[PDB]
Design a protein around this ligand. Structure first.
Ligand SMILES: *[C@@H]1O[C@H](CO)[C@@H](O)[C@H](O)[C@H]1NC(C)=O
Ligand SMILES: OC[C@H]1O[C@H](O)[C@H](O)[C@@H](O)[C@@H]1O
Ligand SMILES: [Ca+2]
Length: 470
């Protein structure tokens, strides 16, 4: 699927091993500290797609699928980022039949499959010096790899040419810029995308790969790719969108978490980074918006406050870009680091009564109803119509999203949002509370916030067929 087809999508990210098991158990243990395979698989994922669709997600980004190393003495490669063979599958997740059945079933539901891919490196269960290169496939010689060194983070060519790690487990760094390696990577992905009907990619460790290699890889794939560019500065991350269709929105992530992790936070750095991303990135609406992933602390590890989590999720889903929710976020999983942030989802019992499950469902539903209602909604830029220390109002076509970090104990506050684009007198509904008000002079909206809850407005007349608020 093209970048254009990906615009209205929203993504539920899973660690395959940690989402759902084929045998349907919601009680197989997953001691996150053990770093073993817990047993999640493709047939498990297929079995719980109603859970995923129930939240309004229409795409799934799964762990890398390639064969890993076998020796688990220093941890099992349950996360898929330690590959040895591009041409074979990790059979812990399933056979090619299982994976083909995943793609088929996603597609029967009108969903998209996004695959995580690593071209930066293979994995080895031992240090750099111990690596037997002949064991890798297809890059079965030291000739295809940069010499081992640790990265000097003040040097971009070191970021690209040194290794992510040289101790056990080592991450031998491929010569992605070598013509033969690039050729093989490109033929590989062109083939893999056809073979398994992949709709999009998520490219691991994109900043550690030279940009031209990224470009020809994305071209060869022939589908939308979002690059994981792990950097908070729009001046660094945004120029990557000249080479990949999208990047994950790390520049917005950092001030977002700073804003909403505590009522002590302020909106100003979020506003500033949003502006900067809009000034720097070719297309902010092809970026992946997230507030969690497997590398960073869970949101609920910063704060237990439900209203704060509702505000970050509202932003995550309703802001410009393609929303991404990390499996567990909706159950308020709280692991503060790797491996604790890879909790098994099945252990929550796939609880559709969780408040953040229902919250995500409503946010996704109004976003998708907005896409349905107006062809131009998805490509219309979000404007910041109001900001102060503790409040942000985002207007994207006819959707007005009003957020606050005042938290659950806030009491009551009133904010007046000027120039929303609603007509004076136009009745709008906050689809989260099903409470209804009207716009006033010049599109002015008088918004009262209570107990730190976000509000999401949509014109009341246009709400029919939504499933929202009767
Ligand atoms: C890698 O594979 C090729 C093709 O079989 C073979 O000729 C070559 O000897 C291998 N290289 C090493 C270092 O084993
Ligand atoms: O897992 C942590 C890693 O996330 C990524 O894949 C980043 O690109 C890399 O810089 C970082 O080490
Ligand atoms: Ca590299």
């Amino acid at each position: 699927a093209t970048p254009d087809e990906w615009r209205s999508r929203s993504i539920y990210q899973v660690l395959t091993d940690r989402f759902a098991r084929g045998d349907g158990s919601p009680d197989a243990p997953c001691d996150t500290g053990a770093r073993k395979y817990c047993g999640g698989n493709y047939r498990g994922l297929i079995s719980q797609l109603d859970y995923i669709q129930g939240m309004g997600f229409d795409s799934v980004w799964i762990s890398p699928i390639t064969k890993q190393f076998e020796d688990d003495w220093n941890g099992a490669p349950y996360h898929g980022y330690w590959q040895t063979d591009l041409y074979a599958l990790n059979e812990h997740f399933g056979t090619e039949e299982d994976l083909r059945a995943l793609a088929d079933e996603l597609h029967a539901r009108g969903m998209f499959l996004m695959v995580d891919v690593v071209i930066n490196h293979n994995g080895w269960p031992g240090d750099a010096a111990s690596i037997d290169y002949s064991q890798f496939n297809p890059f079965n010689s030291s000739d295809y790899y940069h010499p081992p060194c640790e990265i000097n983070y003040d040097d971009q060519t070191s970021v690209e040419q040194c290794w992510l790690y040289t101790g056990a487990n080592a991450l031998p760094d491929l010569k992605t810029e070598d013509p033969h390696v690039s050729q093989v990577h490109n033929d590989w992905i062109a083939d893999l995308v056809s073979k398994y009907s992949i709709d999009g990619l998520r490219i691991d460790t994109t900043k550690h790969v030279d940009k031209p290699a990224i470009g020809s890889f994305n071209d060869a794939a022939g589908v939308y790719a979002v690059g994981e560019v792990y950097h908070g500065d729009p001046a660094y991350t945004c120029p990557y969108q000249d080479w990949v269709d999208g990047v994950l929105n790390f520049p917005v992530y950092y001030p977002l978490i700073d804003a909403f992790k505590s009522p002590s936070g302020t909106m100003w750095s979020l506003v500033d980074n949003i502006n900067k991303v809009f000034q720097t990135c070719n297309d902010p609406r092809l970026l992946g918006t997230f507030s969690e992933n497997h590398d960073i602390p869970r949101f609920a590890s910063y704060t237990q406050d439900l209203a704060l989590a509702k505000n970050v999720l509202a932003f995550t889903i309703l802001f410009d870009g393609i929303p991404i929710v990390y499996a567990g976020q909706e159950q308020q999983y709280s692991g503060d680091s790797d491996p604790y942030n890879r909790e098994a989802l099945w252990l929550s019992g796939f609880n559709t009564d969780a408040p953040l499950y229902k919250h995500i469902a409503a946010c996704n539903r109004i976003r998708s109803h907005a896409v349905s209602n107006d062809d131009a909604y998805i490509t219309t830029p979000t404007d910041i119509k109001y900001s102060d220390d503790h409040t942000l109002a985002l207007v994207k076509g006819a959707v007005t999203t009003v957020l606050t970090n005042a938290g659950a104990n806030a009491g009551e506050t009133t904010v007046t949002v000027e120039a929303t684009g609603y007509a004076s007198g136009e009745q709008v509904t906050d689809v989260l509370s099903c409470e209804s008000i009207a716009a006033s002079d010049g599109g002015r909206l008088s918004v009262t916030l209570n107990q730190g809850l976000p509000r999401v407005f949509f014109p009341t007349d246009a709400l029919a067929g939504s499933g929202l608020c009767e």
